Amino acid sequence: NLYFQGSGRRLVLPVSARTSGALRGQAHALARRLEERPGLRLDDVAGALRADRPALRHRLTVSASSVPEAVEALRAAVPAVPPVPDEPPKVAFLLPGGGTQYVGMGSGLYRENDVYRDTVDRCAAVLRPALGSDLRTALFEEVEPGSTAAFMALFVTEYALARTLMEEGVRPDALIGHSLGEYTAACLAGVMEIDEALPVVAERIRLIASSGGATVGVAACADTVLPLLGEGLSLAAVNSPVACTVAGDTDAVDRLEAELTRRGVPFRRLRMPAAAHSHVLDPILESFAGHLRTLTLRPPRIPYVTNVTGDWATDAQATDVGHWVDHTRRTVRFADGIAALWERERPVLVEIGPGDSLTKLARARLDGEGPVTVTTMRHAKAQAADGFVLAEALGRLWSAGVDAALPH
Numbered sequence: 357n358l359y360f361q362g363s364g365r366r367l368v369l370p371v372s373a374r375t376s377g378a379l380r381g382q383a384h385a386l387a388r389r390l391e392e393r394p395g396l397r398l399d400d401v402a403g404a405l406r407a408d409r410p411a412l413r414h415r416l417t418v419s420a421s422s423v424p425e426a427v428e429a430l431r432a433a434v435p436a437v438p439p440v441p442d443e444p445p446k447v448a449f450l451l452p453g454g455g456t457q458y459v460g461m462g463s464g465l466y467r468e469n470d471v472y473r474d475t476v477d478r479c480a481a482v483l484r485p486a487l488g489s490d491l492r493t494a495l496f497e498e499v500e501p502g503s504t505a506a507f508m509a510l511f512v513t514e515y516a517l518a519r520t521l522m523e524e525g526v527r528p529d530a531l532i533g534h535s536l537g538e539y540t541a542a543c544l545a546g547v548m549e550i551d552e553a554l555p556v557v558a559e560r561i562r563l564i565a566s567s568g569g570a571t572v573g574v575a576a577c578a579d580t581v582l583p584l585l586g587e588g589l590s591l592a593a594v595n596s597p598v599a600c601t602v603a604g605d606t607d608a609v610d611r612l613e614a615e616l617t618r619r620g621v622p623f624r625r626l627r628m629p630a631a632a633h634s635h636v637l638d639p640i641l642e643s644f645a646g647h648l649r650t651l652t653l654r655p656p657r658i659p660y661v662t663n664v665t666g667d668w669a670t671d672a673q674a675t676d677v678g679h680w681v682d683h684t685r686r687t688v689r690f691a692d693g694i695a696a697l698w699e700r701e702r703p704v705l706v707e708i709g710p711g712d713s714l715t716k717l718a719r720a721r722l723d724g725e726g727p728v729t730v731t732t733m734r735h736a737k738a739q740a741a742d743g744f745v746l747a748e749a750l751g752r753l754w755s756a757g758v759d760a761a762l763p764h
């Protein structure tokens with residue numbers, strides 16, 4: 357059952373000291389105090405940790421739904437982020453592309469968080485005409501892998517999760533999306549309106565899927581891979597010094613994999629039999645533009661880097677149908693874009709969506725600038741509750757210096 361339950365007992369307990377060393381001890385002191393004081397309710401400690409202490413430079417948090425849990429976590433507590441900077445840090449949202457979606461994602465947030473519930477409900481209703489079904493079936497019960505609904509489930513999950521973070525007062529200073537995630541970024545930035553984007557993204561997915569072809573993810577930098585392509589092959593994504601993807605017709609991809617295998621290059625065929633970001637899409641570009649022409653495009657009110665150039669999007673690009681056509685046809689320059697995003701703001705990098713695929717690419721590309729990264733929703737196999745994962749994210753954001761992230 358996905359009946360609304362509201363927020364749990366789950367609370368975030370903040371701790372801040374003036375030394376990394378006083379942090380460890382003060383977290384252990386608080387643990388002893390909770391043991392030796394059965395009067396102390398958990399909600400009073402939480403409120404008191406906010407109102408009665410100054411938010412100092414060295415921070416950590418625990419999440420807990422009860423007192424023994426909080427005590428256990430406070431003993432194991434290790435500072436995890438650097439001391440907060442003197443100016444408040446910038447925040448960036450990283451919005452993943454296809455590949456991480458799964459049935460059941462965000463079902464915990466759907467039942468605890470009314471912004472997440474309402475955003476999902478609204479998107480599901482807008483999408484019924486283009487999709488032919490209720491998206492919430494695909495989100496929470498069952499879905500055909502790689503279907504239109506499966507990818508729309510990811511788009512709406514990213515969008516709902518970002519709205520949920522923004523309602524907590526975590527608003528991004530910059531955005532970057534990977535592939536499909538660039539549409540979520542555009543909706544969040546004000547370039548597109550979510551209600552107009554939803555059916556257009558859906559028809560876009562259908563046109564890409566019906567174009568056939570194949571995509572292979574290669575664990576190597578693009579400079580190593582480029583000489584091996586390939587009539588019938590395009591560089592589909594340049595993701596990090598050890599990650600790129602190649603797309604084209606199936607026979608050409610087969611041949612590339614044989615050559616990669618002869619050179620010891622690790623690779624894996626992506627499950628979706630499509631070839632987004634390659635010449636295979638040429639026959640549907642004009643028809644896709646016709647759908648793009650239904651959108652009211654506006655200049656971004658939150659800055660974002662586009663995968664077309666791997667750089668900040670201009671107002672002229674954001675509002676241009678042919679640029680959005682380029683976004684679908686051309687290499688996703690994510691490695692360049694994450695470096696452009698980092699050089700300007702040095703922001704906290706917050707992955708908005710299931711898993712940690714963009715976080716790993718950011719860490720590989722930004723080595724060793726020491727980026728602070730925050731993950732926001734679990735992988736398909738993880739046993740953690742969605743609301744626990746979210747509470748941890750918000751605590752960690754507060755520990756990095758994003759004060760509005762602490763709930764209550």
Ligand SMILES: *C(=O)[C@@H](CCCC#C)C(=O)O
Binds near residue numbers: 561562630684
């Ligand atoms: C990247 O995320 C691509 C996903 C295509 C899936 C289909 C069909 C994209 O360009 O959206």
